[PDB]
DNA sequence: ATCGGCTTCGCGCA
DNA sequence: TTGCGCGAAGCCGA
């Protein structure tokens, strides 16, 4: 039994006789999952087993092997984890609107549950699934602490507007997780080949170095529920105490390193928050970190949920479009094309340094993300093209890419969504400016450049 | 209300 | 480096 404001009736309906079916999507984990926890609870009152069903869409050919393997190795571990609680896992392979709604038929499912994403394509799928199922259809926010549609019913203009609203809801929703009770009813293709198949598809596209070896180094983030925990734990032990004072230094590995895990659902951020809240470190440090994993993460959901064009110019706030529109004819000092950005071929060795961190590691430092996308706007031929170029490089190369945090962060950087207006520059209007020189007062830039020094020539 | 306060940007200056 | 103030800037919301 759990908080019901975590649930939303999609298709009002009458209960079916068969298994309760969890259509997993965003939250790829067995522990700390309110979606799976609710489907087990309604599975228990109907005395049916609960099964999980995952769909593998052809969206993987938009990304690279790095994302596809991180997740495929992640699913492979969950699969063993679900089986131990007697919950079988089914892996469909196609377009969900057709595939889920015909799984529901072939399987006589009693009722249907999914997790919550604000991305446009998921909602498109749901309404397809809804039109073609008889059984009721339930939705659970397992990704935010406070449910997106409960935190605030409108678009939030800034962190300080949303921050009260979220924090007066924290006592009621920041609670611990119960246990996933294993199935008691035991019930009636393979992830190996699907990985081999998908890798073969993506190989022609891999990002190589001149010497025909790949760029991406797969050893900075082991994928999986197990590996994620040892990251959250090492963070609370080694880094959190100094997080607030070094969050902004791209030479200190002092971030949480959590975002590939949170993105794929491999760890609950509600578990993190519990574990930070009880953990005993710098009060300033906890407050800075909680503002990121709580306020900034869950507002980025608030962004895409209430702004369908979250990845377009029209989503920017009224003043910001006015400013960029005023400066559309200004002569840019430089203009680069996508693949020149991609290949680290700017005049700015600090900018190429971080492009190099993105290519080789799959995670750009969070301070260097704000700079990277501001310099794209400043050296691209138009607002729209900057956006386009930045999303394409983010989602193609970030492990945490294709995520509401990506868009709301790109919108923040380029269009100022969730930000204020600043002193008026040429080209970038009133958009918050960051300078190379700003980064020199904050951290030894020569060390950052030095680290990824000798990848540009080695991968030209 | 109508005036403070805002992811803490950048750069002077000590 | 590293705080601390000051400048330029639009608007939510109490
Ligand atoms: C241009 C640009 C591009 C991106 C992003 C921001 C910007 C400015 N972000 C957000 C942020 O850069 C990223 O979430 C963290 O750096 C991920 O690293 P850590 O988890 O180590 O962060 P860290 O430990 O500092 O923070 C912990 C968590 O806080 C959240 N968080 C931090 N900064 C945030 C931000 N500005 N917006 C939203 N949530 C935030 C994340 O969930 C993050 O994992 C993003 N994030 C992401 O998950 N996927 C993406 O594709 C992108 N892309």
From TrEMBL:
Q: Which residues bind FAD 1?
A: 243, 256-259, 292, 363, 369, 394, 400, 405
Q: Where are the transmembrane segments?
A: none
Enzyme class, spelled out: lyase
The record, for InterPro entries, names: Crypto/Photolyase_FAD-like_sf, Crypto/Photolyase_N_sf, DNA_photolyase_2, DNA_photolyase_N, Photolyase_Class-2, Rossmann-like_a/b/a_fold
**Cofactors:** coenzyme F420-(gamma-Glu)n; FAD
- GO MF, any single term: DNA binding
Report the PROSITE patterns cross-referenced here. Answer: PHR_CRY_ALPHA_BETA
Listed under catalytic activity are:
cyclobutadipyrimidine (in DNA) = 2 pyrimidine residues (in DNA)
- Where is FAD 2 bound in this sequence? 243, 256-257, 259, 363, 394, 400, 405
One of the protein's GO biological processes: UV protection
Recorded E.C. number(s)?
Answer: 4.1.99.3
Keywords (A to Z) from UniProt: Chromophore, DNA damage, DNA repair, DNA-binding, FAD, Flavoprotein, Lyase, Nucleotide-binding
Cite the Photolyase/cryptochrome alpha/beta domain residue spans from the record: 18-148
NCBIfam families xref list: phr2
Q: Tell me its family.
A: Belongs to the DNA photolyase class-2 family.
Q: What is this protein called?
A: Deoxyribodipyrimidine photo-lyase
Organism field: Methanosarcina mazei (strain ATCC BAA-159 / DSM 3647 / Goe1 / Go1 / JCM 11833 / OCM 88)
